[PDB]
Design a protein around this ligand. Structure first.
Ligand SMILES: [K+]
Ligand SMILES: [K+]
Ligand SMILES: [Mg+2]
Ligand SMILES: [Mg+2]
Ligand SMILES: [Mg+2]
Ligand SMILES: [Mg+2]
Ligand SMILES: [Mg+2]
Ligand SMILES: [Mg+2]
Ligand SMILES: [Mg+2]
Ligand SMILES: [Mg+2]
Ligand SMILES: [Mg+2]
Ligand SMILES: [Mg+2]
Ligand SMILES: [Mg+2]
Ligand SMILES: [Mg+2]
Ligand SMILES: [Mg+2]
Ligand SMILES: [Mg+2]
Ligand SMILES: [Mg+2]
Ligand SMILES: [Mg+2]
Ligand SMILES: [Mg+2]
Ligand SMILES: [Mg+2]
Ligand SMILES: [Mg+2]
Ligand SMILES: [Mg+2]
Ligand SMILES: [Mg+2]
Ligand SMILES: [Mg+2]
Ligand SMILES: [Mg+2]
Ligand SMILES: [Mg+2]
Ligand SMILES: [Mg+2]
Ligand SMILES: [Mg+2]
Ligand SMILES: [Mg+2]
Ligand SMILES: [Mg+2]
Ligand SMILES: [Mg+2]
Ligand SMILES: [Mg+2]
Ligand SMILES: [Mg+2]
Ligand SMILES: [Mg+2]
Ligand SMILES: [Mg+2]
Lengths: 42, 90, 273
RNA sequence: ACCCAUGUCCAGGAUGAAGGUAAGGUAAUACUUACUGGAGGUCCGAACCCACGCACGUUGAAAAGUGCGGGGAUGAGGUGUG
RNA sequence: GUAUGAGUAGCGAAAGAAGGGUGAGAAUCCCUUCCACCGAAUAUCUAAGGUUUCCUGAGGAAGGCUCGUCCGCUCAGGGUUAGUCGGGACCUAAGCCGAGGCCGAUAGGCGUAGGCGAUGGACAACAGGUAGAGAUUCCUGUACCAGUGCUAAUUGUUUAACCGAUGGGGUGACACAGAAGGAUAGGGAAUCGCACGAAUGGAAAUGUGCGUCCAAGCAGUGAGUGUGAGAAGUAGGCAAAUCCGCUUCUCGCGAAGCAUGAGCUGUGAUGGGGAACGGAAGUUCCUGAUUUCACGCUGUCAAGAAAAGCCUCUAGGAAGAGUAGUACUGCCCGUACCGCAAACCGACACAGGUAGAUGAGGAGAGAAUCCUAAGGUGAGCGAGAGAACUCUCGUUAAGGAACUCGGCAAAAUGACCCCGUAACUUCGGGAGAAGGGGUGCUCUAUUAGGGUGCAAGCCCGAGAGAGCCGCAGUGAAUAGGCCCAGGCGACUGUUUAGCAAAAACACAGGUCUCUGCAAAACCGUAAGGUGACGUAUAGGGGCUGACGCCUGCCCGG
């Protein structure tokens, strides 16, 4: 089998906004993506 | 805010086919509730409402060349009235 | 008693078990059950700190009074029960109050007997007294290091201490290890050994049964790689190519005493095992 | 990979451990024969899991597979969700 | 950017044919008929995931490995209806966050209360119709849960009808295996009805085909399975208790009563569905579940979630209370479609992978296997020559391992029954050892005998004879090659995902060693944790590696 086995819950609870904003080093990711100007933050 | 809850009727062949059974397909605010829609219709047309149904629709993806975007998110209520009441016309 | 299994296949070729005569019921006390959840040597952090643990049959914690705070009240012994959470067995006790508790089963404790606690309790298997009020020579278990904390020291199966004297505020106790120790005299203990004396004699007989008991495989260091163990490596079977055998963290394994050299318990310890 | 909690899956057949009952047998035990019983990291064997051999593929149907055979298959089992 | 190879390799596992039709144009689209494929699936549901791919009408630029008049493609319009389904407003598990707090150069780490969090627990609706697209949603009928008001009766007022926790207690609340039963889904016979009654020698019936129904709910019943009953008194259940728990007496048990309880009978039904728009028959019997009773019973050891919800108990609150019938009320999200697949994961319309419920018949132990049913498909390049070589297959004179690193591969064995079965043995095994024989059909045969049943009838089918035919009778497919000797490792198991399955790892067992509990050891700066909710018959580390007989000398380093 293969390595992407999707799940919305897993996706969001790992890589999602609240998981980023829970963590000091995930708010930098968002600061850094807003600094490049990405249409999508997480 | 009845006139704000009830945005539009849904004029289509399905809807017209269904009007003869005293059922009316309205497009409504996506934050409305079934019960709000009931009392709003009863206000605005002086009918009696027996039952109110409701579905939510995602937006469809459309194109015009280089440019994609989803049509607006829709909420479609299907009111039905007590048989011993007066009709909404269209 | 012990039950040899006939060698009907090589998993049973030398399996032995218990026949479980001492046990009368198989329905524990729901009001005294609590849950347990396997940790598999994992930690606060999630890291495997203590190896060789994980993945057995699940268990419930049976709440066991080691303190014996219920003084003077008589308790009828109702039943003796298996506890997976210990080698010993546990005896259920209905007090005349209506309270129900469990205790360690002592050797010879029978269903139907009556149990007491406190200074007015005769020296009889099941009764718990302060070492202040226990005569020399008697055999005890479930000793506590501190009053009111609970019995803490001899609790396992077939296990017994023996009183040797007094030192005023203290009392000398030969624990099961041969260690004579000074323990306070306001510290309680039970009279008697422990019921499951046969426990040590059981041949598990099968790899799976240690798994069921919750015990993962032990891998030796002489097989590991040098990154993984100081006995690792060598282009074959290699001996312990070091001054001493070694744990996976240095720190010699054989003979090396790991007790702290400046411990507060030193002078309460009268004779090391 | 290891683990945690919670679930779920394993067609069908075979063998016949302890124990128990009865007859025989004894001063009484032994002990024998039958029947019952249903144990097992038990057997055979699909699903499921694995991957022993060979061939083919080898700018592949596929960045590790296909076909013919092969091992385990109530357990140290397989798998799902988190 | 364009060449070269080069009009080359390839066009991605498989059965199509013809006739009609549409159309500018047809191997490729639509229809029909024959044919073929899957069928414990190549069917039917449905999670997760994808997110409009669904339907309709136009279209053929590009995409589709060809083609295209078609599409999961492009445009444009439409389509997803819930008090009862599933998730929330109900509960909690692992885990996560975490007021305060404890730690810590900062940042932050841990963590109590508390709160989130299903893969689990609780919880009330069933059957039909639905011709473009949804259905326990809509519609038709019949109901259920919770609440509200309106009527009509009844009752209560402070020694208080009633409600009753934010607290207490019982249940909830549970493993694994085994066996036997009851019932039912299902399957199949006659029976009943409807149609046919026949092409090619024969048959007007021992003829052929098709079908031979219906819930939830309400009332009643019930294979049965569990369970002893009352009275007193209470050192206990953060306070309280009329409840639980404990104790003591009385009456004792294939007898009731109380809980559950599959299913069954009548209603529901003067309805619906259904083979000829209408509407026939709907009985009897056999087999029989992997479903349900039901983790109910029995046994075992490895000793098998919590909380809510339910019932009760008081603490309390109490002037309004419940009964019947009425009519009304009942929120949010999802609901299309795919869902062993061309729509998910794989860059592809990829021979890969993808959880669970159902999953029929003959023969059969069987979800094996062969053929098939319902139902789905005919796999997105073709036709035609039938040459070397390559691949997958099939058969081969005589010999039969001479091949070869090596019997690699292939061939052979193969199923049920019967006879019989060695050395050795840890007395269980070896052992399906080996080696051999028999299997078909017909009559004795509604069989000897069994199962079922009130009987009629309906299934299973034991030997035996007497015969018949073939080269051959598990006539197909599916289904062990065996033996002797030896080394290694006892064993089952694990291992280098993607060159090594092993004599390597583990294993039970042995032994040494450490450790007195704020154990030792480990993670971490510390707090905090594992260890362990354990306590030397326990825990950590090292070595050895079942079992048997044994394990010797040396302490100078
Ligand atoms: K769920
Ligand atoms: K079949
Ligand atoms: Mg809805
Ligand atoms: Mg260990
Ligand atoms: Mg190595
Ligand atoms: Mg090193
Ligand atoms: Mg070394
Ligand atoms: Mg060497
Ligand atoms: Mg050397
Ligand atoms: Mg086995
Ligand atoms: Mg085998
Ligand atoms: Mg294979
Ligand atoms: Mg097998
Ligand atoms: Mg699978
Ligand atoms: Mg996972
Ligand atoms: Mg060329
Ligand atoms: Mg070619
Ligand atoms: Mg098959
Ligand atoms: Mg379509
Ligand atoms: Mg094309
Ligand atoms: Mg929640
Ligand atoms: Mg549909
Ligand atoms: Mg659907
Ligand atoms: Mg093709
Ligand atoms: Mg030949
Ligand atoms: Mg020949
Ligand atoms: Mg040769
Ligand atoms: Mg040669
Ligand atoms: Mg071979
Ligand atoms: Mg081995
Ligand atoms: Mg490999
Ligand atoms: Mg290999
Ligand atoms: Mg060992
Ligand atoms: Mg500490
Ligand atoms: Mg070794």
């Amino acid at each position: 089998k293969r390595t992407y086995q999707p799940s919305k819950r897993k996706r969001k609870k790992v890589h999602g906004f609240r998981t980023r904003m829970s963590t000091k080093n995930g708010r930098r990711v968002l600061a850094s993506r807003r600094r490049k100007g990405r249409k999508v933050l997480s | 805010d009845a006139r704000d809850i009830i945005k539009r009727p849904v004029v289509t062949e399905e809807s017209t086919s269904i009007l003869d059974d005293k059922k009316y397909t309205f497009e409504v605010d996506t934050r409305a509730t079934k019960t709000q829609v009931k009392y709003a219709v009863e206000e605005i047309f002086d009918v009696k409402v027996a039952k109110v149904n409701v579905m939510n629709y995602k937006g469809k993806l459309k194109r015009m060349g280089r440019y994609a975007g989803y049509t607006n998110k829709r909420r479609k209520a299907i009111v039905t009235v007590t048989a011993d009441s007066k009709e909404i016309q269209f | 008693a012990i039950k040899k299994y006939k060698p009907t296949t090589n998993g049973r070729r030398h399996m032995t078990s218990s026949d479980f005569a001492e046990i009368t019921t198989s329905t524990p006390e729901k009001s005294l059950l609590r849950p347990l959840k396997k940790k598999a040597g994992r930690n606060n952090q999630g890291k495997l700190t203590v190896r060789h643990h994980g993945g057995g049959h699940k268990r419930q914690y049976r709440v066991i009074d080691f303190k014996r705070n219920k003084d003077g009240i008589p308790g009828r012994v109702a039943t003796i029960e298996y506890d997976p959470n210990r080698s010993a067995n546990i005896a259920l006790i209905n007090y005349a109050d209506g309270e129900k508790r469990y205790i360690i089963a002592a050797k010879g404790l029978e269903v139907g007997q009556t149990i007491y606690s406190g200074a007015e309790a005769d020296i009889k298997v099941g009764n718990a007294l302060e070492l202040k009020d226990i005569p020399v020579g008697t055999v005890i278990h479930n000793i506590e290091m501190k009053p009111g904390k609970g019995g803490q020291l001899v609790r396992s199966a077939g296990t017994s201490a023996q009183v040797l004297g007094k030192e005023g505020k203290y009392v000398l106790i030969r624990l099961n290890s041969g260690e004579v120790r000074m323990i306070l005299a306001t510290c309680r203990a039970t009279i008697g050994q422990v019921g499951n004396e046969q426990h040590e004699l059981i041949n598990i007989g099968k790899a799976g049964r240690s798994r069921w008991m919750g015990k993962r495989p032990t891998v030796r260091g002489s097989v590991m790689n040098p990154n993984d163990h100081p006995h690792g490596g060598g282009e074959g079977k290699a001996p312990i190519g070091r001054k001493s055998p070694m744990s996976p963290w240095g720190k010699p394994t054989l003979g090396y005493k790991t007790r702290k050299k400046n411990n507060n318990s030193d002078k309460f310890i009268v004779r090391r095992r």
